[PDB]
Design a protein around this ligand. Structure first.
Ligand SMILES: N[C@@H](CCC(=O)N[C@@H](CSC(=S)NCCc1ccccc1)C(=O)NCC(=O)O)C(=O)O
Ligand SMILES: N[C@@H](CCC(=O)N[C@@H](CSC(=S)NCCc1ccccc1)C(=O)NCC(=O)O)C(=O)O
Lengths: 221, 221
């Protein structure tokens, strides 16, 4: 049990940001894929899940649930959480904006069909007018290669992950954000992240209809 | 030196857990209330809001947005975030469960009238069968006065705040969790918290009709 062990169903979902961070940190992990409501109930009954939910990661003797608890620990453990409390505040402020946007995109597929169009348009408007400007502005103001402390952090990893999902959405959205483009390229070419982006890795594909129906079967929603 | 300043409207909303945490830490703070969309637009134009939203807290030379960024910083600063990353992992796991429940309760008032009762019922069920059981188990597990590290942390503060909102919802819900009942009593009698719970503190009341209108008008939803 040297490898962290990720419990989740076979999809990006709430576990993918953790997959990215671990990979960018060069940490190898195992994944135990939930395939059925029965598998989830198994974990639930063996007392593995504090709030009866996944994501859960077995790491360092712990059974960590809650996405942010997992990410925070992993980021600290591998020195990707800034150097002090004030760097951490910037990292936290940045990645919480990223989380807000990411949550909107993550849930788009379960928007009621009569709300789907307006929600997509809202997401595009916020990307254009709120989130991309905010992060371009940060890069522009210190001119450095990384978001915080002139050094690779979880913030660059989380943001670049999001850039890939926005590109899947509408490849034109990032067009007028040169600094964001540059960041995506630099980060994507880091050896650990390059390897994750390449075919064959544990990186997961966009959720399709089949996958969405598996999640409804498993999590009973 | 300079007191923290809390930028929000005059309500609990997303700023109340910050008010609790600062107050519990014995930190005096000031509030600048937003009363109109025009006040919000000023903070925006002034460049004070990274994502054009509040909560915003001015603290130690930073304009901190994002509830979790704010709370994380304050928790670390006043030694309420555990003594090592393993304790922070437990704290994070606990408080993210508290966040999940708090979010359901926070947004209850903006449920459409034909969803209000169903949603309320779900909440009560999750309190009774998922969340209170988890936190009671943690307390029963080590038998100590505080959730983590045998010492006051943000987890105790965030939980007890939540126990007060649950009491407003349905005073019977806590009835079969003696350790939670006793935690609430103990934390409520810490000098700093006791003063916050007394009249005249920055502690805010439950949202009533007018408050909600002020919120729609101000934040344009
Ligand atoms: N705040 C928690 C949330 C955990 C959570 O919601 N877990 C889900 C599983 S996570 C999820 S549903 N993954 C897919 C998300 C998704 C669904 C549909 C379309 C797109 C994405 C779960 O366990 N449900 C069972 C239950 O609560 O009884 C966290 O961040 O870890
Ligand atoms: N993830 C962010 C979210 C901040 C946020 O949503 N702020 C709202 C204001 S906070 C909120 S609306 N508080 C009221 C809570 C409430 C809502 C509905 C019913 C009852 C209470 C805002 O600024 N909206 C304007 C905009 O996005 O353009 C954070 O935690 O800080």
């Amino acid at each position: 049990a040297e490898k962290p062990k990720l419990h989740y169903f076979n999809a990006r979902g709430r576990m993918e940001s953790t997959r990215w961070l671990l990979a960018a940190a060069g940490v190898e992990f195992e994944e135990k894929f939930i395939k059925s409501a029965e598998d989830l109930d198994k974990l639930r009954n063996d007392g593995y899940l504090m709030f009866q939910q996944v994501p859960m990661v077995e790491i360092d003797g712990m059974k960590l649930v809650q996405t942010r608890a997992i990410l925070n620990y992993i980021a600290s453990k591998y020195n990707l959480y800034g150097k002090d409390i004030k760097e951490r505040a910037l990292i936290d402020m940045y990645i919480e904006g990223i989380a807000d946007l990411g949550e909107m995109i993550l849930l788009l597929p379960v928007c009621p069909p009569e709300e789907k169009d307006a929600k997509l348009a809202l997401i595009k408007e916020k990307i254009k007018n709120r989130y991309f400007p905010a992060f371009e502005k940060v890069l522009k103001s210190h001119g450095q290669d990384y978001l915080v402390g002139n050094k690779l952090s979880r913030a660059d990893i989380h943001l670049v992950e999001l850039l890939y999902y926005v590109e899947e959405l509408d490849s034109s959205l990032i067009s007028s954000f040169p600094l964001l483009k540059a960041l995506k390229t630099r980060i994507s070419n880091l050896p650990t992240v390059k390897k994750f982006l390449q075919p064959g890795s544990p990186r997961k594909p966009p959720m399709d209809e089949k996958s969405l129906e598996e999640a409804r079967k498993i999590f009973r929603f």
